Each structure stands twice: as C-alpha cells, then as structure tokens.
C-alpha cells in the first residue's frame, strides 16, 4: 500500500482487508519514510505484542492542511460526510508526501470529496452514492442548478502550490477485536539459541526454565512441545531448526 | 488542464446576432456547468447567467430577455447566443468552471467583444522618442502611443520582444468608438540615438500592421 | 433581485496587517448547515479567481492567507497577512438565490511609502510630423499614491481639449503607480511655440513639476 500505484478518493477508498499474516508496526515508525506517523490510543510498539481479528487499510489522498482533521473527535467536511471516525478509535493514522507521484502537470483534478449529505455516515462506512439534494426550498430533481449544490468537488493537486495543497497519501489503520479468533498478530523477535546452559527459553508454543540439550527423541511434525507422565515440560522442539 | 478560451467575434454591428463559442477542453464538460460574466462594462464585475449540467438555463434580471446559452456536449463547446446587441454589451466575456456549492473555481482567457455602429479604424502609431538635448531624472523611459485603434486588441512589442525587463502595459481607454493604448519601458540612457530600436505595432482585429521606428 | 451591498469601496492596508471587507446579503440562508457566500479577487490586468468557498474551507491556486467568517446576513473577508500581490478588487457572490450576481467591488490598495514621479516628456520626431499630427506624451511613472492632478500647460494658452490620461491601478509586480498623459495636436500647433511645459501636481511633491523641451530636438 505504501508502494501502490494510485489511491482512490476520500469517500470511495479501496479498503484492503488484511488477514492471515504478521506485520511489524515498530519498524514502520523508524523507517524514516513517512511524513506523519501518529497513532491514537495504542502505541505502535505495543501493536506487535497484540493480536487483532480484522485489519482494514483505508487508503485515500487529502491535502496538506487536512491531516489534522483525520482524527477522532475533530470536525470538518471530510470528517463527517466522507470519513467518519468513532469516539473510541484505537487505530493509527499515517501519512507521507506524494507530490511527485500522484500530481499531474497543471493540476490533478480527478480526486473528489463529498461536501454534504442527507445524514451523517456511520464510522468505518464507505458510501459511493451520488444523490443530489437541494439547498433551498425549490428542488431541481436531477440536473443541478437554481440553488442546487453539487455534493462532490474536485481536489486541487498542483505541483507548484503551497505545502497545504500538495497530495498526501493517508492510510488509516482500522483495528477491531470480536468473538472470532484473531488473524493478524505481530512477529516475535527471535534471539540466538544457547544450549548446555541453565537459562530460560521462550518458544512460539510454550516457555519455561531448563537446560536444553540434544537427545534421540523424535517429535511429530504438527507438535511444538511435549510433556512427561507428571504433566511437566520435559522436551521441546525448536521452531526454527528442526 | 482547464482550457476556456474564446474566439470568433471580432466586430459586431448593433441590432444583430452572434454566438460566442467558448471551447472547453482538458476536463469533462458533462460534469460541470459553464458560467458567463463580463469584464468591466462601466461598473465592476457583472454576472450574466449559468448553464446547468445538461439541463435548463438561468439568467440575470437584465440579461434574460436578450441572451441565451446553448451547451453542446458533442463538440465540447458552450455557445452564448446573443440577441438584440446594443452599445452597452461592450465588455470582455469569460467562461468559468463550476465548483461544488455553485462556485466559480477556474477561469478562462475569453475574447474582446465590441459592438458599435462605427466601422473599424486603423491605428495611428506614433513612437515616443527622446530629444537630442532632453534630460531625465535617474530613469529613462521608452514607449509608443497607439491611439485611435478600433476594435481591441493591439499587441505592442519592441524589436520582436527584446525589451522585457521594465515593460509596463497600460489598459485600453474606452472612448467614443475609439481606444487608446499607452506603453512605458524602462531603458538605459544608451538606447537612443545609439541603439537602433523599432517599435512594432500589430492590430489583429483589423489585420493592419503599422510599424514605426523610434 | 438580491442587492449585495459591499462596503467599503476602497481600502489602504499596508504589509503585514489584516484587511476587513464586508458583504451584506438577505436571501437565501440555511443551505445544508451554513449560509455563507463565495469570495473572489479580480486584478485590473488579470481575470479573477476563487479565494475561499463557503467561508470554512480551502481552495487550491491561492495561498491560505484568505479566510473569514460572518453571520447569516453580514460576511467578513480576512486577508492576513497582506502581501505584495493583494492589490486588486474583491467581490462576493450570492449562491443561495437567483440572481447570482456579484458585489460592488472593494479596491484594496497596498499602503506603501510615498514617492515622487519621474520627470520625462517625449516630443515626436521629424518623421512623425510628416503625417500631419504630433504626439507629445509626458511620462509620470513610479509614484504613490494615485492622487495626482496632471494638466498640460502650453506657454501661449491652456489646452485641455485634446488631452487623455491613462490611469492604471497598482500592478501585481510593481508596487507603484504609472500613468501616461497624452496630448493630441497637429503640426501647426507643434510649430507654434518653441517650448512646451508639462505641469503635474502630486501629493508628495507640493511644488508643481516643471519640465520643458524644444521643438528642434528631432
């Protein structure tokens, strides 16, 4: 998503459903490639030690001064009628500059944003409807005009404008936890394996304390640890080396 | 990316009809509505009408019974049909790109429309040259006065675009069926009679080229 | 008909200050959540452009110095800070009711330091007198403010019949004013007197500017 071709609008975003994988969130904060890296509620270093059920990456492009409006508890036209954030938003909002990638010569006016709607949208709800509602008491009933405002408007993405109007690729990371088992977790940082020493061990399946040494036991390929007659961890299999 | 230039009207007689063609290019005409205004018809900015997104038309109170807007989606051009033209319709027309909440975001170049009973007049080119013993006060100017041309516009240059640093373009003075164009270019003291300077004056409205040396 | 009373007609705001331009409207209000209008800026030598729509958002092509707010009837445009490219007229357009006309126009002028105009006047050459006419133009450039009384004064008698002044507003590049005073006369009027005096009265120069030439300078 960071190296994608081109993002969509702020109301018709391509929600990439992330599942059945692992992702290091602490390496993205120190990657020195993002212009804005600020999470809300949950630290990105704590995301590697926590699992989530479904992860949604809402990718859209806004202007330079609109990065403060993509936050829980803020106002704005894009925050109410385009991308509604909940009051308990525990995700993360990242951004980086894309003025030399998404802009065009003379101005990229393909990105749209909704100005108004009949009602406020739900949090994490995508609406691609283009219904036109009148402003005054006289409806236009189709073709706009005579006090009939168009709900959309073209974004102005020029290569020579100020920093507040440059295109900025913003990917909002949505996190949730339900009764379903989790699919997205963080990668456990591995260390060197030391044998023939009274030290601790912490594998992917079970941890404990004891000296690990080679023997003649052979485990099944779908097992990671074992128990004796007294129900005590007496033998373990290394996850990296078989 | 926004092209809203105009061409076609050069010199119109009163009590006649002519349609102003504003060529729309670079963006979708079927998703926006082209507006129409005038540039300084005696007073300030005046608004004429607004073409819908392929629907009906709206006009002003003083511009409904005489003006009409025709939108052609096939040729990507919006026509501005004018009926019963008088001397009060002498202004520079513009086309505008529609915004979200009925706003006029982007603008065009337009053309100069002049309606008068008098015929066209060739310009009387007279360059403004200093004397042999003329003095100055820390600044030497240079210009060529184009007075008595009809209609607008007139492009004034010096040696096919040699002087470009301190060129000051004066606006056209609206007179009785005439126009006056002044000019002032900051030049060094060795410009006359040392440097051979020739002010070229071109009148594309009447196709008359009268060039006079400094 | 909606009469958009725009006040004031002119302003003198220097650099780094805040300009206040009012705009009064009556109909209509309560579009979807607001009742604001649009703001524009028209230069005397450039077509206009949109500054800020609905007084609460941003628009590309213009810097973020333009903002403002207002009530359901009165509206305020905030130009903060005023740079060297804001010397232009301003308008407000009604969007809630037909006709969607503009205002009267507030001519914002940049309050700069006063300066005296140049002292120059160019007589026509000998080749220009062969056609029969004569074009004497007195040059008065790089001055401030625009309050200047130019009057052609021939030494024989005053002539204010075939004169014409080209009053230009404050340019976008040049912060000072530039006006060209013209004089239309024949060859017999040019060969009448030997010297011709260009008189000008300025706010900074209280003394009348005197600059003459000779008819033999050809």
Residue numbers in the entry:
A (entry chain A): 341 to 582
B (entry chain a): 1 to 214
C (entry chain b): 1 to 218
Extract from the study:
Spike (S) protein protrudes from the surface of the spherical virions and mediates virus entry into host cells. Moreover, we captured an ensemble of cryo-EM structures of SARS-CoV-2 S trimer in complex with the Fab of 2H2 or 3C1 up to 3.8 Å resolution, revealing the MAb-triggered stepwise allosteric rearrangements of the S trimer to coordinate the binding of neutralizing antibodies targeting the SARS-CoV-2 RBD, also providing structural basis for MAbs 2H2 and 3C1 as noncompeting antibody cocktail.
To investigate the molecular basis of 2H2-mediated neutralization of SARS-CoV-2, we resolved four cryo-EM structures of the stabilized SARS-CoV-2 trimeric S glycoprotein in complex with 2H2 Fab in distinct conformational states, termed S-2H2-F1 (associated with one Fab), S-2H2-F2 (with two Fabs), and S-2H2-F3a/S-2H2-F3b (with three Fabs). Our S-2H2-F3a structure reveals that each of the three RBDs binds with a 2H2 Fab, with two RBDs in the up conformation (protomer 1 and 2), and the third RBD remaining down but can still engage with a 2H2 Fab (protomer 3). While in S-2H2-F3b structure, all the three RBDs are up and each binds with a Fab. Interestingly, in step 3, our data suggested that there are two possible reaction pathways.
